[PDB]
mmCIF file of all heavy atoms in Angstrom:
data_model
loop_
_atom_site.group_PDB
_atom_site.id
_atom_site.type_symbol
_atom_site.label_atom_id
_atom_site.label_comp_id
_atom_site.label_asym_id
_atom_site.label_seq_id
_atom_site.Cartn_x
_atom_site.Cartn_y
_atom_site.Cartn_z
ATOM 1 N N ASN A 1 8.673 -3.067 12.896
ATOM 2 C CA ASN A 1 7.262 -3.581 12.716
ATOM 3 C C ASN A 1 6.830 -3.210 11.249
ATOM 4 O O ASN A 1 7.007 -2.154 10.696
ATOM 5 C CB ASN A 1 6.394 -2.786 13.659
ATOM 6 C CG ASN A 1 6.693 -3.351 15.086
ATOM 7 O OD1 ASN A 1 5.937 -4.147 15.607
ATOM 8 N ND2 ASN A 1 7.654 -2.901 15.752
ATOM 9 N N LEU A 2 6.137 -4.106 10.576
ATOM 10 C CA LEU A 2 5.554 -3.848 9.266
ATOM 11 C C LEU A 2 4.590 -2.760 9.135
ATOM 12 O O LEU A 2 4.058 -2.297 10.201
ATOM 13 C CB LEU A 2 5.015 -5.194 8.749
ATOM 14 C CG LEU A 2 6.134 -6.180 8.456
ATOM 15 C CD1 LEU A 2 5.465 -7.701 8.361
ATOM 16 C CD2 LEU A 2 6.736 -5.826 7.129
ATOM 17 N N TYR A 3 4.124 -2.358 8.023
ATOM 18 C CA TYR A 3 3.177 -1.233 7.886
ATOM 19 C C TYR A 3 2.071 -1.737 6.887
ATOM 20 O O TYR A 3 2.331 -1.548 5.758
ATOM 21 C CB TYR A 3 3.936 0.043 7.568
ATOM 22 C CG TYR A 3 4.316 0.807 8.771
ATOM 23 C CD1 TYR A 3 5.496 0.378 9.407
ATOM 24 C CD2 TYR A 3 3.541 1.868 9.181
ATOM 25 C CE1 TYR A 3 5.797 1.055 10.586
ATOM 26 C CE2 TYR A 3 3.922 2.541 10.263
ATOM 27 C CZ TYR A 3 5.057 2.142 11.152
ATOM 28 O OH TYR A 3 5.459 2.824 12.282
ATOM 29 N N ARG A 4 0.865 -2.068 7.285
ATOM 30 C CA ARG A 4 -0.181 -2.322 6.359
ATOM 31 C C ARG A 4 -0.884 -1.101 5.863
ATOM 32 O O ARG A 4 -0.799 -0.128 6.505
ATOM 33 C CB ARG A 4 -1.081 -3.240 7.131
ATOM 34 C CG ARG A 4 -2.175 -3.853 6.368
ATOM 35 C CD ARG A 4 -3.569 -3.213 6.686
ATOM 36 N NE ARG A 4 -4.485 -3.871 5.837
ATOM 37 C CZ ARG A 4 -5.108 -3.272 4.804
ATOM 38 N NH1 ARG A 4 -4.375 -3.208 3.740
ATOM 39 N NH2 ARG A 4 -6.323 -2.841 4.858
ATOM 40 N N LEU A 5 -1.453 -1.126 4.664
ATOM 41 C CA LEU A 5 -2.223 0.039 4.140
ATOM 42 C C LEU A 5 -3.392 0.273 4.850
ATOM 43 O O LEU A 5 -4.295 -0.575 4.888
ATOM 44 C CB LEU A 5 -2.452 -0.420 2.671
ATOM 45 C CG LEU A 5 -2.955 0.823 2.000
ATOM 46 C CD1 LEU A 5 -2.372 0.872 0.560
ATOM 47 C CD2 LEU A 5 -4.529 0.733 1.778
ATOM 48 N N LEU A 6 -3.439 1.481 5.601
ATOM 49 C CA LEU A 6 -4.636 1.697 6.390
ATOM 50 C C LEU A 6 -5.788 2.227 5.413
ATOM 51 O O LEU A 6 -7.009 2.029 5.663
ATOM 52 C CB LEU A 6 -4.239 2.885 7.197
ATOM 53 C CG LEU A 6 -5.367 3.073 8.313
ATOM 54 C CD1 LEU A 6 -5.368 2.035 9.340
ATOM 55 C CD2 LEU A 6 -5.059 4.482 9.032
ATOM 56 N N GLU A 7 -5.368 2.883 4.364
ATOM 57 C CA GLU A 7 -6.428 3.422 3.309
ATOM 58 C C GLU A 7 -5.821 3.751 1.964
ATOM 59 O O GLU A 7 -4.676 4.379 2.032
ATOM 60 C CB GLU A 7 -7.052 4.590 4.135
ATOM 61 C CG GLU A 7 -8.602 4.444 4.046
ATOM 62 C CD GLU A 7 -9.187 5.681 4.762
ATOM 63 O OE1 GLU A 7 -9.256 6.667 4.137
ATOM 64 O OE2 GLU A 7 -9.661 5.564 5.900
ATOM 65 N N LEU A 8 -6.409 3.408 0.900
ATOM 66 C CA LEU A 8 -5.808 3.832 -0.373
ATOM 67 C C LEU A 8 -6.694 4.994 -1.045
ATOM 68 O O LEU A 8 -7.832 5.122 -0.875
ATOM 69 C CB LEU A 8 -5.910 2.502 -1.257
ATOM 70 C CG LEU A 8 -5.448 2.774 -2.710
ATOM 71 C CD1 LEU A 8 -3.992 2.989 -2.627
ATOM 72 C CD2 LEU A 8 -5.837 1.621 -3.573
ATOM 73 N N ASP A 9 -5.923 5.877 -1.715
ATOM 74 C CA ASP A 9 -6.567 7.105 -2.291
ATOM 75 C C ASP A 9 -6.845 6.785 -3.822
ATOM 76 O O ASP A 9 -6.367 5.807 -4.342
ATOM 77 C CB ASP A 9 -5.554 8.231 -2.174
ATOM 78 C CG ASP A 9 -6.267 9.521 -2.257
ATOM 79 O OD1 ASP A 9 -6.833 9.845 -1.219
ATOM 80 O OD2 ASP A 9 -6.296 10.035 -3.329
ATOM 81 N N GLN A 10 -7.657 7.673 -4.335
ATOM 82 C CA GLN A 10 -7.981 7.427 -5.856
ATOM 83 C C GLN A 10 -7.334 8.625 -6.604
ATOM 84 O O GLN A 10 -8.005 9.691 -6.873
ATOM 85 C CB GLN A 10 -9.499 7.600 -5.986
ATOM 86 C CG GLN A 10 -10.020 6.558 -7.187
ATOM 87 C CD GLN A 10 -11.297 7.067 -7.521
ATOM 88 O OE1 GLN A 10 -11.536 7.830 -8.463
ATOM 89 N NE2 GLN A 10 -12.437 6.679 -6.817
ATOM 90 N N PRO A 11 -6.104 8.511 -6.977
ATOM 91 C CA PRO A 11 -5.312 9.435 -7.735
ATOM 92 C C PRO A 11 -5.750 9.617 -9.178
ATOM 93 O O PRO A 11 -6.398 8.745 -9.638
ATOM 94 C CB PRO A 11 -3.781 9.082 -7.611
ATOM 95 C CG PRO A 11 -3.891 7.517 -7.365
ATOM 96 C CD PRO A 11 -5.256 7.247 -6.699
ATOM 97 N N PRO A 12 -5.196 10.600 -9.829
ATOM 98 C CA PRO A 12 -5.436 10.819 -11.239
ATOM 99 C C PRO A 12 -4.797 9.801 -12.172
ATOM 100 O O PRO A 12 -3.810 9.146 -11.677
ATOM 101 C CB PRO A 12 -4.896 12.202 -11.455
ATOM 102 C CG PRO A 12 -3.792 12.309 -10.533
ATOM 103 C CD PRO A 12 -4.194 11.696 -9.257
ATOM 104 N N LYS A 13 -5.337 9.483 -13.332
ATOM 105 C CA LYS A 13 -4.768 8.465 -14.182
ATOM 106 C C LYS A 13 -4.587 7.012 -13.484
ATOM 107 O O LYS A 13 -3.446 6.846 -13.037
ATOM 108 C CB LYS A 13 -3.360 8.991 -14.638
ATOM 109 C CG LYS A 13 -3.510 10.373 -15.268
ATOM 110 C CD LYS A 13 -4.252 10.283 -16.614
ATOM 111 C CE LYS A 13 -3.505 9.694 -17.745
ATOM 112 N NZ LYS A 13 -4.370 9.525 -18.822
ATOM 113 N N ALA A 14 -5.551 6.381 -13.244
ATOM 114 C CA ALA A 14 -5.508 5.128 -12.557
ATOM 115 C C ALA A 14 -6.389 4.121 -13.378
ATOM 116 O O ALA A 14 -7.576 4.183 -13.486
ATOM 117 C CB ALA A 14 -6.115 5.372 -11.202
ATOM 118 N N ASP A 15 -5.743 3.120 -13.744
ATOM 119 C CA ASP A 15 -6.395 1.966 -14.518
ATOM 120 C C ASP A 15 -6.963 2.475 -15.844
ATOM 121 O O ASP A 15 -7.909 1.987 -16.267
ATOM 122 C CB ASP A 15 -7.412 1.420 -13.672
ATOM 123 C CG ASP A 15 -7.792 -0.058 -13.824
ATOM 124 O OD1 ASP A 15 -6.917 -0.878 -13.600
ATOM 125 O OD2 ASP A 15 -8.857 -0.342 -14.440
ATOM 126 N N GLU A 16 -6.240 3.306 -16.502
ATOM 127 C CA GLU A 16 -6.585 3.900 -17.759
ATOM 128 C C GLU A 16 -5.458 4.214 -18.575
ATOM 129 O O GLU A 16 -5.401 5.205 -19.342
ATOM 130 C CB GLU A 16 -7.409 5.060 -17.435
ATOM 131 C CG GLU A 16 -6.773 5.942 -16.373
ATOM 132 C CD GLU A 16 -6.039 7.105 -17.084
ATOM 133 O OE1 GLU A 16 -6.694 8.062 -17.505
ATOM 134 O OE2 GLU A 16 -4.824 7.147 -17.133
ATOM 135 N N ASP A 17 -4.228 3.579 -18.368
ATOM 136 C CA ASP A 17 -3.035 3.945 -19.175
ATOM 137 C C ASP A 17 -1.927 2.881 -18.816
ATOM 138 O O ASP A 17 -1.233 3.079 -17.796
ATOM 139 C CB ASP A 17 -2.627 5.314 -18.695
ATOM 140 C CG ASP A 17 -2.145 6.169 -19.852
ATOM 141 O OD1 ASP A 17 -1.494 5.697 -20.756
ATOM 142 O OD2 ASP A 17 -2.555 7.381 -19.858
ATOM 143 N N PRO A 18 -1.850 1.901 -19.711
ATOM 144 C CA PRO A 18 -0.820 0.902 -19.373
ATOM 145 C C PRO A 18 0.662 1.368 -19.700
ATOM 146 O O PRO A 18 1.469 1.109 -18.916
ATOM 147 C CB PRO A 18 -1.204 -0.338 -20.419
ATOM 148 C CG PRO A 18 -1.950 0.377 -21.503
ATOM 149 C CD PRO A 18 -2.625 1.621 -20.888
ATOM 150 N N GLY A 19 0.805 1.932 -20.886
ATOM 151 C CA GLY A 19 2.232 2.352 -21.230
ATOM 152 C C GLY A 19 2.659 3.405 -20.130
ATOM 153 O O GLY A 19 3.827 3.437 -19.797
ATOM 154 N N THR A 20 1.834 4.365 -19.671
ATOM 155 C CA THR A 20 2.178 5.292 -18.684
ATOM 156 C C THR A 20 2.027 4.770 -17.277
ATOM 157 O O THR A 20 1.109 3.982 -16.997
ATOM 158 C CB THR A 20 1.298 6.454 -18.849
ATOM 159 O OG1 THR A 20 1.237 6.893 -20.262
ATOM 160 C CG2 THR A 20 1.752 7.630 -18.123
ATOM 161 N N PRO A 21 2.920 5.138 -16.384
ATOM 162 C CA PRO A 21 2.873 4.615 -14.980
ATOM 163 C C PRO A 21 1.655 5.169 -14.283
ATOM 164 O O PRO A 21 1.019 6.090 -14.680
ATOM 165 C CB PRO A 21 4.121 5.204 -14.402
ATOM 166 C CG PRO A 21 4.638 6.355 -15.222
ATOM 167 C CD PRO A 21 4.044 5.920 -16.646
ATOM 168 N N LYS A 22 1.319 4.639 -13.150
ATOM 169 C CA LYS A 22 0.096 5.040 -12.336
ATOM 170 C C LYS A 22 0.500 5.779 -11.110
ATOM 171 O O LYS A 22 1.072 5.037 -10.215
ATOM 172 C CB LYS A 22 -0.707 3.816 -12.148
ATOM 173 C CG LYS A 22 -2.154 4.019 -12.626
ATOM 174 C CD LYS A 22 -2.148 4.042 -14.242
ATOM 175 C CE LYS A 22 -2.154 2.579 -14.789
ATOM 176 N NZ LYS A 22 -0.752 2.464 -15.442
ATOM 177 N N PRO A 23 0.181 6.998 -10.950
ATOM 178 C CA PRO A 23 0.598 7.722 -9.796
ATOM 179 C C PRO A 23 -0.344 7.187 -8.609
ATOM 180 O O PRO A 23 -1.487 7.631 -8.471
ATOM 181 C CB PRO A 23 0.274 9.221 -10.047
ATOM 182 C CG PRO A 23 -0.704 9.160 -11.142
ATOM 183 C CD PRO A 23 -0.586 7.880 -11.967
ATOM 184 N N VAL A 24 0.173 6.376 -7.702
ATOM 185 C CA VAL A 24 -0.613 5.808 -6.589
ATOM 186 C C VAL A 24 -0.536 6.768 -5.383
ATOM 187 O O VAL A 24 0.509 7.404 -5.249
ATOM 188 C CB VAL A 24 -0.121 4.487 -6.398
ATOM 189 C CG1 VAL A 24 -0.852 3.745 -5.138
ATOM 190 C CG2 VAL A 24 -0.373 3.590 -7.661
ATOM 191 N N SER A 25 -1.364 6.514 -4.409
ATOM 192 C CA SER A 25 -1.194 7.274 -3.115
ATOM 193 C C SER A 25 -2.009 6.663 -2.006
ATOM 194 O O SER A 25 -3.214 6.265 -2.209
ATOM 195 C CB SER A 25 -1.759 8.683 -3.379
ATOM 196 O OG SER A 25 -0.719 9.582 -3.803
ATOM 197 N N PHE A 26 -1.518 6.300 -0.737
ATOM 198 C CA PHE A 26 -2.268 5.569 0.180
ATOM 199 C C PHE A 26 -1.638 5.904 1.577
ATOM 200 O O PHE A 26 -0.503 6.245 1.751
ATOM 201 C CB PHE A 26 -2.099 4.217 -0.044
ATOM 202 C CG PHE A 26 -0.747 3.744 -0.430
ATOM 203 C CD1 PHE A 26 0.206 3.557 0.565
ATOM 204 C CD2 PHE A 26 -0.373 3.513 -1.769
ATOM 205 C CE1 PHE A 26 1.523 3.150 0.294
ATOM 206 C CE2 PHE A 26 0.860 3.053 -2.103
ATOM 207 C CZ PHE A 26 1.816 2.919 -0.994
ATOM 208 N N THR A 27 -2.356 5.617 2.677
ATOM 209 C CA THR A 27 -1.891 5.824 4.088
ATOM 210 C C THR A 27 -1.487 4.453 4.658
ATOM 211 O O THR A 27 -2.350 3.535 4.536
ATOM 212 C CB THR A 27 -3.027 6.537 4.837
ATOM 213 O OG1 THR A 27 -4.245 5.896 4.455
ATOM 214 C CG2 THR A 27 -3.118 8.001 4.465
ATOM 215 N N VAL A 28 -0.359 4.304 5.292
ATOM 216 C CA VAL A 28 -0.084 3.007 5.900
ATOM 217 C C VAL A 28 0.080 3.162 7.369
ATOM 218 O O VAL A 28 0.538 4.135 7.958
ATOM 219 C CB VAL A 28 1.333 2.600 5.271
ATOM 220 C CG1 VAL A 28 1.106 2.471 3.726
ATOM 221 C CG2 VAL A 28 2.396 3.669 5.552
ATOM 222 N N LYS A 29 -0.324 2.067 8.062
ATOM 223 C CA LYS A 29 -0.148 2.235 9.646
ATOM 224 C C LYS A 29 0.541 1.069 10.129
ATOM 225 O O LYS A 29 0.902 0.089 9.560
ATOM 226 C CB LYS A 29 -1.691 2.038 10.125
ATOM 227 C CG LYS A 29 -1.751 2.222 11.638
ATOM 228 C CD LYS A 29 -3.236 2.940 11.912
ATOM 229 C CE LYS A 29 -3.221 3.504 13.252
ATOM 230 N NZ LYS A 29 -4.595 3.873 13.625
ATOM 231 N N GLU A 30 1.069 1.197 11.399
ATOM 232 C CA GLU A 30 1.925 0.074 11.964
ATOM 233 C C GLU A 30 1.162 -1.178 12.310
ATOM 234 O O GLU A 30 0.004 -1.147 12.760
ATOM 235 C CB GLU A 30 2.453 0.764 13.313
ATOM 236 C CG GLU A 30 3.933 0.132 13.515
ATOM 237 C CD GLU A 30 4.372 0.808 14.799
ATOM 238 O OE1 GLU A 30 4.432 2.055 14.825
ATOM 239 O OE2 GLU A 30 4.871 0.092 15.698
ATOM 240 N N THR A 31 1.614 -2.331 12.017
ATOM 241 C CA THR A 31 0.880 -3.599 12.222
ATOM 242 C C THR A 31 1.590 -4.353 13.438
ATOM 243 O O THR A 31 2.459 -3.921 14.005
ATOM 244 C CB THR A 31 0.979 -4.571 10.936
ATOM 245 O OG1 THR A 31 2.253 -4.284 10.257
ATOM 246 C CG2 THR A 31 -0.160 -4.177 10.032
ATOM 247 N N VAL A 32 1.002 -5.516 13.731
ATOM 248 C CA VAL A 32 1.665 -6.235 14.996
ATOM 249 C C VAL A 32 2.553 -7.372 14.478
ATOM 250 O O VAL A 32 2.575 -8.412 14.942
ATOM 251 C CB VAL A 32 0.551 -6.842 15.654
ATOM 252 C CG1 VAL A 32 -0.426 -5.712 16.238
ATOM 253 C CG2 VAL A 32 -0.342 -7.755 14.761
ATOM 254 N N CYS A 33 3.380 -7.165 13.394
ATOM 255 C CA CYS A 33 4.319 -8.213 12.897
ATOM 256 C C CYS A 33 5.575 -7.602 12.519
ATOM 257 O O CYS A 33 5.717 -6.499 11.901
ATOM 258 C CB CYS A 33 3.676 -8.799 11.607
ATOM 259 S SG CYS A 33 2.431 -9.958 12.240
ATOM 260 N N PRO A 34 6.762 -8.246 12.923
ATOM 261 C CA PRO A 34 8.016 -7.745 12.636
ATOM 262 C C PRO A 34 8.494 -7.972 11.213
ATOM 263 O O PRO A 34 7.845 -8.713 10.447
ATOM 264 C CB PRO A 34 9.020 -8.624 13.603
ATOM 265 C CG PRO A 34 8.232 -9.928 13.843
ATOM 266 C CD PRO A 34 6.786 -9.524 13.725
ATOM 267 N N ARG A 35 9.457 -7.230 10.778
ATOM 268 C CA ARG A 35 9.854 -7.264 9.308
ATOM 269 C C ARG A 35 9.913 -8.759 8.758
ATOM 270 O O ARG A 35 9.281 -8.976 7.841
ATOM 271 C CB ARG A 35 11.231 -6.634 9.200
ATOM 272 C CG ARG A 35 11.218 -5.468 8.281
ATOM 273 C CD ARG A 35 12.436 -5.581 7.299
ATOM 274 N NE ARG A 35 11.890 -5.646 6.031
ATOM 275 C CZ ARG A 35 11.577 -6.721 5.375
ATOM 276 N NH1 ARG A 35 12.460 -7.426 4.856
ATOM 277 N NH2 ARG A 35 10.392 -7.220 5.532
ATOM 278 N N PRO A 36 10.705 -9.581 9.318
ATOM 279 C CA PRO A 36 10.858 -11.046 8.930
ATOM 280 C C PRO A 36 9.616 -11.808 9.333
ATOM 281 O O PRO A 36 9.560 -12.559 10.180
ATOM 282 C CB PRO A 36 12.131 -11.466 9.703
ATOM 283 C CG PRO A 36 12.223 -10.655 10.848
ATOM 284 C CD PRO A 36 11.646 -9.351 10.476
ATOM 285 N N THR A 37 8.636 -11.632 8.415
ATOM 286 C CA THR A 37 7.210 -12.424 8.722
ATOM 287 C C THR A 37 7.005 -13.382 7.625
ATOM 288 O O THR A 37 6.212 -14.344 7.763
ATOM 289 C CB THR A 37 6.168 -11.371 8.752
ATOM 290 O OG1 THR A 37 6.654 -10.057 8.651
ATOM 291 C CG2 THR A 37 5.302 -11.438 10.214
ATOM 292 N N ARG A 38 7.786 -13.407 6.511
ATOM 293 C CA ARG A 38 7.535 -14.309 5.357
ATOM 294 C C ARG A 38 6.048 -14.094 4.898
ATOM 295 O O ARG A 38 5.415 -15.052 4.280
ATOM 296 C CB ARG A 38 7.625 -15.743 5.977
ATOM 297 C CG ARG A 38 8.964 -15.867 6.722
ATOM 298 C CD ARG A 38 8.846 -16.796 7.839
ATOM 299 N NE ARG A 38 9.808 -16.409 8.890
ATOM 300 C CZ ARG A 38 9.590 -16.518 10.174
ATOM 301 N NH1 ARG A 38 9.549 -17.774 10.691
ATOM 302 N NH2 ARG A 38 9.270 -15.478 10.869
ATOM 303 N N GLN A 39 5.433 -12.927 4.988
ATOM 304 C CA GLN A 39 4.134 -12.626 4.499
ATOM 305 C C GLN A 39 3.876 -11.067 4.389
ATOM 306 O O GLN A 39 4.571 -10.387 5.117
ATOM 307 C CB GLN A 39 3.125 -13.276 5.462
ATOM 308 C CG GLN A 39 3.595 -13.047 6.951
ATOM 309 C CD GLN A 39 2.638 -12.060 7.617
ATOM 310 O OE1 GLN A 39 1.744 -12.272 8.196
ATOM 311 N NE2 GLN A 39 2.955 -10.763 7.567
ATOM 312 N N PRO A 40 2.901 -10.755 3.681
ATOM 313 C CA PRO A 40 2.557 -9.270 3.509
ATOM 314 C C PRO A 40 2.035 -8.753 4.918
ATOM 315 O O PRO A 40 1.558 -9.413 5.636
ATOM 316 C CB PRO A 40 1.511 -9.267 2.467
ATOM 317 C CG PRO A 40 0.845 -10.600 2.501
ATOM 318 C CD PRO A 40 1.924 -11.565 2.894
ATOM 319 N N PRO A 41 1.968 -7.423 4.968
ATOM 320 C CA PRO A 41 1.426 -6.692 6.204
ATOM 321 C C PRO A 41 -0.130 -6.910 6.251
ATOM 322 O O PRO A 41 -0.660 -6.946 7.446
ATOM 323 C CB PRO A 41 1.742 -5.287 6.052
ATOM 324 C CG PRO A 41 1.921 -5.068 4.456
ATOM 325 C CD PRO A 41 2.494 -6.456 3.960
ATOM 326 N N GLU A 42 -0.756 -7.136 5.184
ATOM 327 C CA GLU A 42 -2.245 -7.365 5.265
ATOM 328 C C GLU A 42 -2.487 -8.727 5.965
ATOM 329 O O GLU A 42 -3.595 -8.829 6.587
ATOM 330 C CB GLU A 42 -2.664 -7.373 3.838
ATOM 331 C CG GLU A 42 -4.183 -7.380 3.713
ATOM 332 C CD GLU A 42 -4.769 -6.222 2.956
ATOM 333 O OE1 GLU A 42 -4.175 -5.745 2.083
ATOM 334 O OE2 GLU A 42 -5.786 -5.716 3.329
#
């Protein structure tokens, strides 16, 4: 089963540094769709 993002966090260095990567963090939960869905979990 796919896993849609249940909630996204606000980590340090976000949307303020293009050359440097952005440390992201979020919680994902199980959705009602199998892997081969041809679409995102959202």
Side-chain angles (χ1 to χ4, degrees):
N1 288 264
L2 286 168
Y3 268 80
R4 185 247 186 257
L5 188 137
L6 190 73
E7 235 180 71
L8 176 70
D9 201 84
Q10 211 199 103
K13 305 296 284 174
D15 209 67
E16 47 97 73
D17 224 316
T20 309
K22 234 70 82 251
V24 176
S25 270
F26 46 77
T27 42
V28 299
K29 191 152 190 185
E30 216 177 305
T31 32
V32 298
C33 278
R35 237 227 123 271
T37 355
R38 307 149 209 146
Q39 43 109 89
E42 187 117 33

